[PDB]
Design a protein around this ligand. Structure first.
Ligand SMILES: [N-]=[N+]=NCc1cc(C(=O)NCCCO[C@H]2O[C@H](CO)[C@@H](O)[C@H](O)[C@@H]2O)cc(C(=O)NCCCO[C@H]2O[C@H](CO)[C@@H](O)[C@H](O)[C@@H]2O)c1
Ligand SMILES: [Ca+2]
Ligand SMILES: [Ca+2]
Ligand SMILES: [Mn+2]
Ligand SMILES: [Mn+2]
Lengths: 237, 237
């Protein structure tokens, strides 16, 4: 059982497991049943941007998702990640499809993490920024159907030669190095993540969504976690 | 209207037309509604083996399907093929997908048929064995989406470049030469069929199955027989 904290861009309402009856962004703490959600006007075919922020002083996890010339969706939740996640973790992106599908394209991804301790200017930091993915992206752990190189983008789920999405696909991309997300002696700990995506669906029923997540270092795709589970959870508990 | 006798490896339960509520192997005499069925623990992603046997003395059609280190499923039915099939027929393999899908890969296929008459030691026989299929398999009649050559296997249904199965696909492969399956003057008539298959599905809902069948010589894929009809029957009567 991995420990998962995630911000989900959920495109398909699975009402039987808690989803609001419309596309939404949500904050998931160890469960696919978002602790908090917000309505999201997902725009089929357009490039969007997501910003996730957190700092140990406020203990507030917030996410903003927007499209150019459009309103943005915000969701924020009070949580002390010290009581939830192990000290070291891996961060990544996840996406899936089920009966319904969509392309889950990542055009760019950046992450920053900082630990400031009880010392004179003694800050530890990690920062990576990808604006172009390559055929052999060695600093990324690709899991499931995830692939890179196609137009310099990261395709989290299966796409056919003619560019059409496929169902029952699940894929993840985790940054290669473990991240020191919190530490008992830290005065302030914080991280920020940003990624631009392109979700396109041939019909009017896209599924299932993309997610930014933080997990235990050795995390892997749970069995049968395609569709509603976003490639993150073993079940809907 | 073709005459069809078949042993089906049904992976998807279509309860509204008779299927038990689980994967099963069954004997179909002129109807998709199996005269007899048996529970089958289909193992996703593994190579299985099917053996079909029949002799005119017992007038018993039996089938055994198994996987290495696993139990096998058996189904047997009393039928006098003389009253059902014409004297000459074609034998083959059929498979399909509907809304749900699976790869329907044949790795090998062999068939033996014998007619022993009231003539001291005068036996007629036909035997063919395929352990490798080639790009141009001239002794096979391919119908629907069926293709050969891909890794030396026979793909009964459509598979995309990246190896993922597709829906609404139907394909058949019939041995080129007509088979003399029975004859009024025969003391004993018998046939045996064996094939190994690989059914793989990306999710947990595989469909629709593979079938070994015997039909009239000029048989072709019934219109709209994808999905539940296994590319064998025009309807669910
Ligand atoms: N598209 N569409 N359509 C209608 C439809 C809708 C739903 C549906 O909207 N479900 C919602 C939850 C999806 O839930 C799934 O998708 C969502 C969204 O991605 C995910 O979030 C979930 O986690 C899950 O993956 C289910 C079924 C269905 O089960 N049909 C069964 C008979 C199919 O009968 C057909 O297929 C059979 C087998 O191949 C054949 O035997 C038969 O002849 C015929 O061809 C059918
Ligand atoms: Ca959902
Ligand atoms: Ca069925
Ligand atoms: Mn949701
Ligand atoms: Mn059946």
């Amino acid at each position: 059982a991995d420990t998962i904290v995630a911000v989900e861009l959920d495109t398909y309402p699975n009402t039987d497991i808690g989803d609001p009856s419309y596309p939404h962004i949500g904050i998931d703490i160890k469960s696919v049943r978002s602790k908090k959600t917000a309505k999201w006007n997902m725009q089929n075919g357009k490039v969007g941007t997501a910003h996730i922020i957190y700092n140990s002083v406020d203990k507030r996890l917030s996410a903003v998702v927007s499209y150019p010339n459009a309103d943005s969706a915000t969701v924020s939740y009070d949580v002390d990640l010290d009581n939830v996640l192990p000290e070291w973790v891996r961060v990544g992106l996840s996406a899936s499809t089920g009966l319904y599908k969509e392309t889950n394209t990542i055009l760019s991804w950046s992450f920053t993490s900082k630990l400031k301790s009880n010392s004179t200017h003694e800050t530890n930091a990690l920062h990576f920024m990808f604006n172009q993915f390559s055929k052999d992206q060695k600093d990324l752990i690709l899991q499931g159907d995830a692939t890179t190189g196609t137009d310099g983008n990261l395709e989290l789920t299966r796409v056919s030669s003619n560019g059409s999405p496929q169902g029952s696909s699940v894929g993840r991309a985790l940054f290669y190095a473990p991240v020191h997300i919190w530490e008992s002696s830290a005065v302030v700990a914080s991280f920020e993540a940003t990624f631009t995506f392109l979700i396109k669906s041939p019909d009017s029923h896209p599924a299932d969504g993309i997610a930014f997540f933080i997990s235990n270092i050795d995390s892997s795709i749970p069995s049968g976690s395609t569709g509603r589970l976003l490639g993150l959870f073993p079940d809907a508990n």
